[PDB]
From TrEMBL, chains A, B:
<feature type="transmembrane region" description="Helical">
    <location>
        <begin position="155"/>
        <end position="175"/>
    </location>
</feature>
<keyword id="KW-0479">Metal-binding</keyword>
<dbReference type="GO" id="GO:0005245">
    <property type="term" value="F:voltage-gated calcium channel activity"/>
</dbReference>
<dbReference type="InterPro" id="IPR049456">
    <property type="entry name" value="Anoctamin_N_fung"/>
</dbReference>
<dbReference type="GO" id="GO:0016020">
    <property type="term" value="C:membrane"/>
</dbReference>
<feature type="binding site">
    <location>
        <position position="397"/>
    </location>
    <ligand>
        <name>Ca(2+) 1</name>
    </ligand>
</feature>
<feature type="binding site">
    <location>
        <position position="458"/>
    </location>
    <ligand>
        <name>Ca(2+) 1</name>
    </ligand>
</feature>
<protein>
    <submittedName>
        <fullName>Plasma membrane channel protein (Aqy1), putative</fullName>
    </submittedName>
</protein>
<feature type="binding site">
    <location>
        <position position="425"/>
    </location>
    <ligand>
        <name>Ca(2+) 1</name>
    </ligand>
</feature>
<dbReference type="GO" id="GO:0005254">
    <property type="term" value="F:chloride channel activity"/>
</dbReference>
<dbReference type="GO" id="GO:0034220">
    <property type="term" value="P:monoatomic ion transmembrane transport"/>
</dbReference>
<keyword id="KW-0472">Membrane</keyword>
<dbReference type="GO" id="GO:0017128">
    <property type="term" value="F:phospholipid scramblase activity"/>
</dbReference>
<feature type="binding site">
    <location>
        <position position="454"/>
    </location>
    <ligand>
        <name>Ca(2+) 2</name>
    </ligand>
</feature>
<keyword id="KW-0812">Transmembrane</keyword>
<dbReference type="GO" id="GO:0045332">
    <property type="term" value="P:phospholipid translocation"/>
</dbReference>
<dbReference type="InterPro" id="IPR007632">
    <property type="entry name" value="Anoctamin"/>
</dbReference>
Amino acid sequence: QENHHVDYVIRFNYGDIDTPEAIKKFEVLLLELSEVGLQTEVRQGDENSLFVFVRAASKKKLKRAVYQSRVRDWLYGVPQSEAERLLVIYHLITVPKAEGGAGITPRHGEWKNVDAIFPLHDEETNRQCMREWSKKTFLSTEDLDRIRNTFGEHVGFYFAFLQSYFRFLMFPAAFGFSCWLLLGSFSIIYTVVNCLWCIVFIEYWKRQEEDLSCRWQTKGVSAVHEKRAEFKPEKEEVRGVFPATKRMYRQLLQVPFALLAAVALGAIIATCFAIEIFISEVYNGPLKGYLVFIPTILVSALIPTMSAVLLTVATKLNDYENYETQDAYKVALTQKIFVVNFITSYLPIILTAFVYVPFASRIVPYLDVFHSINPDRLRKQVIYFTVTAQIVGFALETIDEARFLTRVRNEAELEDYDVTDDLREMCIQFGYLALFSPVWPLVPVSFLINNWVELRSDFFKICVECKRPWPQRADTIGPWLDSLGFLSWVGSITSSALVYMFSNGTTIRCWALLLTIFFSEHLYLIVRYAVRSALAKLEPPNTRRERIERFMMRKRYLDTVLSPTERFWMRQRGWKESAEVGLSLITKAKG
Amino acid sequence: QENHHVDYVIRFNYGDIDTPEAIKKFEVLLLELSEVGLQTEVRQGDENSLFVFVRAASKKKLKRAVYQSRVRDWLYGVPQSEAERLLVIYHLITVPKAEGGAGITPRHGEWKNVDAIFPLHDEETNRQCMREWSKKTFLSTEDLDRIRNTFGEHVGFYFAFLQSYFRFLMFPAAFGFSCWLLLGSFSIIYTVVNCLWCIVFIEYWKRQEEDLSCRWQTKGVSAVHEKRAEFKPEKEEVRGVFPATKRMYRQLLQVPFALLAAVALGAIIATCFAIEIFISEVYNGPLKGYLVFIPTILVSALIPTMSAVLLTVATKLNDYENYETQDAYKVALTQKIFVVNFITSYLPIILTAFVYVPFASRIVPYLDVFHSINPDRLRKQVIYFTVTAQIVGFALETIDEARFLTRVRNEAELEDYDVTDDLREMCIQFGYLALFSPVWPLVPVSFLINNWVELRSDFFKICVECKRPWPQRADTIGPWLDSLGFLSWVGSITSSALVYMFSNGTTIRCWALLLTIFFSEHLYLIVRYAVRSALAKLEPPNTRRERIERFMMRKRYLDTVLSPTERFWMRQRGWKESAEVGLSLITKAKG
């Protein structure tokens, strides 16, 4: 065994505080970790901090911790290889000591000296599993089980989702390559099939999630976990509270932030249009096409940086709103990231599809300061916003114990893994497919090539580039599925407006634009209901097995358990007297 | 005790079959009822049928039946005064004998001779409770508990729903009387408040249902019950099946039935319009107004009869589709009754609001065979369709053991109670409020007067006019709540189209009609989401009490339960050695 039976290693800083407080905090830390059933070995690894090591002290204490974790589990209503054995020890460290034990928050409150705690990689399993499916291009269910046993299943749902999305992506890739050689752009045949794919993928992954969360034993996780909330009073079985009206008021800061960000990006896009008209009039290039579209390509390449800036602003605003639980914090964060994603990514194309193309005759005289807008302008917007941001990234890509501790010190300085920074890009790609893929039908091919190139890069990052996350116990990919549903809904309006407005070359005839919007959205809702109710009747195998197991358990437990006025109830004291009375009555009445 | 401890009385016919088979069926009936723990006394009550009486044989058998019913309950995951004590005996009679016992289906299969089984009324409780709140006009929670202990809670949810609907109805009554003296008809102020009321009532009753089903102990009832399905094969733990594709095909008979019913009622309404134009041209009356609108009032009074005819056709079509469970049967029946309700009730007003008023100049020359259509024509349509159908009904309304058995024989010939025939009328009233109440704002007053007149008539009918239903264990009012939600959604489009088309007197300007439809529907969805998410944070008392009880039970049960490589884990065998090693390391590093 490479790791010397180490489960978790707990980093403990001392450089902030002075000397004689650090020994008191260290003594109460080790006293908590030994009061709960954990063994501890401290040896320093950093110049500024020494980290302790934590394993299960004995088999009886480990079985007690496993039984307590299972009791909290099946009271809330929700060992194995490594996920269960590391999850019960992370609960043993972190769970707030009214239950479970030892109540260690990572760095926030009363525990500001201890830094992040983290398990250790198993480099044999990681290297063999990384080089095993370097030539597979499609993982299997046993393979997702091998990524579930390590890393937990919060990683398992993310990897299963990315593999299922990559498998469903090659139907619009083949279709939008077939509908590009044959029948051009802005086509009803491609638009109806694209909206059907956007419905079917979400309504199929919503079923695959239930199947996968019945296969793995994490069926329903609504066990909410507290976080570093800053309570002002102490209401009273005591708990710190925070009123729902001050959070309501603080949540109204999202409206001026989103309005000002939309106004600023509209100013940037209008500046780019003005510079484009300037280089269109003033001759500046022998090729003249790529040089007249220089600022669009520059801002399309620069959009990830301003998106990351707005992500840090939204993260600080989300920390200001002071959520009590972690589920509501993640929901609010995903909503703010969705708003920033919309404003940054789809507004430079909505702003030129519905404002600048049709109103070119009234905005070109307003933007031609210091003295021909086709739908090809919109098609080149979609090209430069779904191609160049990845072309630029690829072009920047091409250009004794002394051996164990020196890799523990190397793992302790790595960064921390997240799912959201790699799943936001999935949400952006699905928005580009849902909203205005009928403009240029090679958007699914341009996304399939990028996903096929960066297929194993996320697994490489989760193995060797960042430290191992503690095995979480997720049930869904999160609120991103609700974001995908909303994004498909907006796409069924946007794509059907664009197809009416730009196919076959005049007068827009609004009495027909709004009728197309109305009928296409209310056809989307009906088709989504039909696909959802059809897929709810086809049952995947890993939930049928659990339903059959639960029915057999119920049937066995039920087969175990089963194996004055009174002058009325004395005439027929049994069965045979009632039978002969009925015999006499039928013979008398039928005779 | 008036009823001589009789729980259920089981009617058994013999006039269909001959003599010597009836004694065999009677003997196996009494053998089943005595094999399960029930006492039986048979005495004849009809000329054509003799019915047995059923009570619990002993206290040990009654406690065994109660424990078996509770075991099936809390295995499916879902005594008292009369509801529990009669429910366990109805399960003891009916439950299909693989569990529970005695497997008696009422009249369908293998048991065609036995007619409907039924409990007996308690006339003291019924008369005292009927004359107690003859002067109350608003029932209390203890009062709904007294209607829950008798009659079960499938009656309790219906009575609580009708009382809550009557309490919420007097806000649009007072508002539409206030908005009628002041600001006329087709008004935005009344339309926005009417749509807000239609949202708030449904999103408040959806919360009151959870509160009431936590107060009563019927939290989640998804325990599906089989019915008289006609299986063709015997698949194999054996069960008869029916393929989901033959039911799918049989369910496509609803489309030609609804299309032909809509075409027939459109023909009737066009005939009424032609006769109205005929009496408008040919002078026939000194008053001339009521005489020119004679056929509208005649068909508006006749609509309940053709609606009942279409209900029998829809019931036969629903029996043709051969559903396996009773929940899916009730859902499909409620959907067909909703379609018939729409076609019969709101199509004669949609057909004159969106076809005949605006297209009067192109349809009056087509309907004036044998040789002025204002919005007042639409207002008089709404008046004659929401007033005269109840005025006609009110005008037709104004113009030893020998004593116990002679009332058991009287109760055995009564009809059978249902909820659907009195809840369909609620759904029709809510549709008239949701869709086109802005046309004539005294529609809520005309409904409030009718409900206040017929307030206690349903309780009178459930006591003395029909026999007592067995105590069912419902959880919701049913699919009618989903029908009310769909009906409010259609109303937010219809009312906002009518208000644009008919307020302040020309050119319709479609680019504005469809924009009003779009913005009003997507404002309805946002306001419904906001009201639903706001009401999900205000917790009613009877579910907070159950949450506190379950949390205290979990806390008590959790406080009960808690009260080479190895040369690494030998340097510090305990806590004090790790403490002094950490002390030496901090003093060496900080020195």
